[PDB]
């Protein structure tokens, strides 16, 4: 097994520092049940 | 909602110590205690103790505190809410009075008043 | 041990049984929760009922619980054939362990 | 304790339900290339916020963080007991198990509000 | 029935007053030429919405769809009976007949709110 | 009288507290060089407004102009009597004397709301 250098696709460079990161989207609305009801 | 497979029937003799395994899957291992319970011939079932894989804390009955080695590994996460864990059990001064089936049991909840309650069990291991 | 159960009781198909579970003040009952376990002989048990009357997931609504100041009771409404086993009760709190009971074998021969 | 933004992300739904104003603060402020890319973000942030405030307004929960409603919990959505939800599952697990039925509930929370004030307009019609 | 967005546009004011959350949903979401023309629209939509939510906030109707007030109906605005408004006229006809007096009412709905909470600050001053 | 926008800027805090809807109206509407400079302003105006409406929402004051809370007045913030504040000082003077402690109060007004509705979710749990 022999290994040779190379590259070119410049996103390999950014990928070597953006591997630690990930974008997520906050969705703060949650529906869940309890024994609670509103008055009249 | 996962399995808690254990080791085999390792029958030794008095004086020695026996190590029994408990490999988990299907659930986040660090989220629930691992209770240890035995049903020997001569008594009924007896609660030995549980250990928290997250807090690393241990609580066990005074009838087994000076006998039981209770340790755990650290989970190898599989997915976001799944993992694979491992809990170990040993006993010191072993006799023929400790002959019986031994199981591990995942705790019930992650909060409330029934947190450590042995809910999800394994299959059993026959001692001496 | 100290948590004396109901020795043994028999039953019949379609009927309902009742298992006792009581001990001294040091383990029962008004200051402790009670859990009930269906335990086949030396095999995989099953949590039926925790925190007195609360049922575990997947537990049929046949099993009902009730804890008085002196004794805890486990009912098995509408006996189905797959019910013959030994039932154990455990006394516990939030930061303690299980004080298992003496056991009660239930027969359904009918 | 003060866990911080999304601190109770792995905690039970009962524990996280007490730390709501933490994630409520940083939902609108924060915890010529990019002048048009920055302005494109300062507009998107407001639109996502006003949508969540729009649904809260048509459910009667405008200004509420914990808001009780009139829609009873259909067991078809999740046949889980109460103590096996808030003392066991995390809010991330819950949003997955209710992913499908989440749109059904949002409509039921609307007409239960428009009929409610329509009943209140009659309650004060005397 | 579910008429849809503006479905009851030709229906009586009493019938349309029950289908308010239908038009309330699509008021903020929907039922490089145009990158700057699209962004110009995504900003205008929020500003028109926040103005309508601004007036509702200074009238005490924040979160309300049907909101009862304290301003009595001046017969000079429209001397029409109640059953000849909600069971006869459409909301499009009504907005024309009250076109002039519409600005007078918006001010009366404001000070009737600032004096109301000023009275409530005294109601809780003991 | 009708002083106008910021009319009671030099008046006592008690007099100005009755003319709040005057400054509340002109906070969102008003009393290709600058096409991108105008749009830059039409976005900033909404963001400043939604921040002030964000704090009012997490304090339980959404829709309120005068809003009473649960946080008792710490004498360390200002050891001034009641009649020497509202009948003597102006709102501009007050904002200076409470400049430091202004951030402490905003947090206390938040958890006093999240604990309040957490108590109300238990009040309706029966
Ligand atoms: C991350 O995920 C983990 C795992 O899911 C969470 O850990 C679990 O947290 C819950 C609640 O936070 C725990 O339940 C509680 O259990 C206690 C029992 O602890 C007592 O006894 C222990 C053994 O004697 C002892 O370790 C404790 O002593 C302290 O010191 C240890 C040092 O090792 C420290 O680590 C502990 O944390 C203790 O502080 C203690 O004496 C039980 O008493 C609790 O019940 C009370 O409170 C509940 C409400 O909270 C109430 O309903 C009860 O009636 C009772 O009043 C409570 O049930 C659970 O044991 C933890 N471990 C598990 C599930 O394996 C962790 O919280 C998560 N963190 C985040 C940030 O998400
Ligand atoms: C058993 O417990 C003892 C307690 O001191 C600990 O030192 C030891 O490491 C444990 N057993 C093993 C195999 O690690
Ligand atoms: C549950 O939802 C189904 C449709 O998803 C509906 O047909 C049924 O009536 C609902 N049941 C209850 C009790 O609300
Ligand atoms: C517990 O939850 C189950 C749903 O899984 C429900 O059928 C049962 O009635 C609940 N019991 C109690 C006591 O709330
Ligand atoms: C949602 O719908 C998909 C359809 O592919 C289904 O696989 C999934 O199980 C549904 N969600 C739940 C919680 O059942
Ligand atoms: C009706 O409005 C006029 C001004 O348009 C006003 O002078 C009059 O007092 C009002 N009447 C009532 C009863 O409100
Ligand atoms: C009906 O409306 C008219 C206004 O056109 C009014 O004068 C009259 O008092 C009303 N009658 C009733 C019974 O409401
Ligand atoms: C509004 O004012 C105009 C002034 O030209 C007048 O013609 C019109 O009749 C007024 N509206 C109504 C409903 O009277
Ligand atoms: C006043 O604030 C200080 C901190 O600024 C705090 O330590 C103290 O407890 C507060 N006193 C009262 C009465 O709220
Ligand atoms: C007046 O304000 C002072 C604070 O400077 C306070 O100590 C005093 O108790 C107040 N008296 C009355 C009657 O409110
Ligand atoms: C606020 O802090 C500064 C710190 O330099 C201090 O000089 C000032 O007196 C403080 N404000 C008040 C009202 O005391």
PDB file of C-alpha atoms in Angstrom, chain E residues 50-108:
ATOM      1  CA  UNK E  50     -46.377  44.364  13.070  1.00  0.00           C
ATOM      2  CA  UNK E  51     -48.488  47.496  12.565  1.00  0.00           C
ATOM      3  CA  UNK E  52     -51.698  45.480  12.903  1.00  0.00           C
ATOM      4  CA  UNK E  53     -50.193  43.734  15.929  1.00  0.00           C
ATOM      5  CA  UNK E  54     -49.135  47.143  17.271  1.00  0.00           C
ATOM      6  CA  UNK E  55     -52.697  48.484  17.296  1.00  0.00           C
ATOM      7  CA  UNK E  56     -53.974  45.271  18.891  1.00  0.00           C
ATOM      8  CA  UNK E  57     -51.346  45.691  21.618  1.00  0.00           C
ATOM      9  CA  UNK E  58     -52.268  49.270  22.524  1.00  0.00           C
ATOM     10  CA  UNK E  59     -55.999  48.384  22.579  1.00  0.00           C
ATOM     11  CA  UNK E  60     -55.621  45.491  25.022  1.00  0.00           C
ATOM     12  CA  UNK E  61     -56.462  42.955  22.294  1.00  0.00           C
ATOM     13  CA  UNK E  62     -52.988  41.411  21.957  1.00  0.00           C
ATOM     14  CA  UNK E  63     -53.638  37.742  21.244  1.00  0.00           C
ATOM     15  CA  UNK E  64     -57.367  38.266  20.622  1.00  0.00           C
ATOM     16  CA  UNK E  65     -59.256  37.676  17.382  1.00  0.00           C
ATOM     17  CA  UNK E  66     -62.655  38.845  18.656  1.00  0.00           C
ATOM     18  CA  UNK E  67     -62.013  41.564  21.238  1.00  0.00           C
ATOM     19  CA  UNK E  68     -64.647  43.495  23.181  1.00  0.00           C
ATOM     20  CA  UNK E  69     -63.829  47.041  24.249  1.00  0.00           C
ATOM     21  CA  UNK E  70     -65.172  49.981  26.272  1.00  0.00           C
ATOM     22  CA  UNK E  71     -65.904  52.495  23.478  1.00  0.00           C
ATOM     23  CA  UNK E  72     -69.694  52.635  22.981  1.00  0.00           C
ATOM     24  CA  UNK E  73     -70.932  52.656  19.404  1.00  0.00           C
ATOM     25  CA  UNK E  74     -71.647  56.221  18.316  1.00  0.00           C
ATOM     26  CA  UNK E  75     -74.816  56.138  16.214  1.00  0.00           C
ATOM     27  CA  UNK E  76     -73.271  58.878  14.057  1.00  0.00           C
ATOM     28  CA  UNK E  77     -70.777  56.315  12.734  1.00  0.00           C
ATOM     29  CA  UNK E  78     -73.586  54.039  11.511  1.00  0.00           C
ATOM     30  CA  UNK E  79     -77.223  54.158  12.638  1.00  0.00           C
ATOM     31  CA  UNK E  80     -77.885  50.548  11.658  1.00  0.00           C
ATOM     32  CA  UNK E  81     -79.531  47.938  13.857  1.00  0.00           C
ATOM     33  CA  UNK E  82     -77.589  44.910  15.057  1.00  0.00           C
ATOM     34  CA  UNK E  83     -79.502  42.315  13.024  1.00  0.00           C
ATOM     35  CA  UNK E  84     -79.150  44.451   9.871  1.00  0.00           C
ATOM     36  CA  UNK E  85     -75.334  44.401  10.174  1.00  0.00           C
ATOM     37  CA  UNK E  86     -74.199  40.859  11.008  1.00  0.00           C
ATOM     38  CA  UNK E  87     -76.989  39.012   9.147  1.00  0.00           C
ATOM     39  CA  UNK E  88     -77.137  41.238   6.054  1.00  0.00           C
ATOM     40  CA  UNK E  89     -73.973  43.199   5.253  1.00  0.00           C
ATOM     41  CA  UNK E  90     -70.590  41.813   4.237  1.00  0.00           C
ATOM     42  CA  UNK E  91     -67.298  42.847   5.813  1.00  0.00           C
ATOM     43  CA  UNK E  92     -66.376  44.545   2.530  1.00  0.00           C
ATOM     44  CA  UNK E  93     -69.533  46.675   2.644  1.00  0.00           C
ATOM     45  CA  UNK E  94     -68.950  47.525   6.308  1.00  0.00           C
ATOM     46  CA  UNK E  95     -65.388  48.764   5.764  1.00  0.00           C
ATOM     47  CA  UNK E  96     -66.753  51.256   3.217  1.00  0.00           C
ATOM     48  CA  UNK E  97     -69.579  52.612   5.391  1.00  0.00           C
ATOM     49  CA  UNK E  98     -67.111  53.105   8.274  1.00  0.00           C
ATOM     50  CA  UNK E  99     -64.247  54.367   6.085  1.00  0.00           C
ATOM     51  CA  UNK E 100     -64.246  57.915   7.457  1.00  0.00           C
ATOM     52  CA  UNK E 101     -64.821  57.194  11.155  1.00  0.00           C
ATOM     53  CA  UNK E 102     -62.258  54.355  11.161  1.00  0.00           C
ATOM     54  CA  UNK E 103     -59.463  56.661  12.357  1.00  0.00           C
ATOM     55  CA  UNK E 104     -61.555  58.143  15.178  1.00  0.00           C
ATOM     56  CA  UNK E 105     -62.236  54.694  16.636  1.00  0.00           C
ATOM     57  CA  UNK E 106     -58.561  53.674  16.639  1.00  0.00           C
ATOM     58  CA  UNK E 107     -57.702  56.536  18.996  1.00  0.00           C
ATOM     59  CA  UNK E 108     -60.643  55.896  21.305  1.00  0.00           C
TER      60      UNK E 108
END
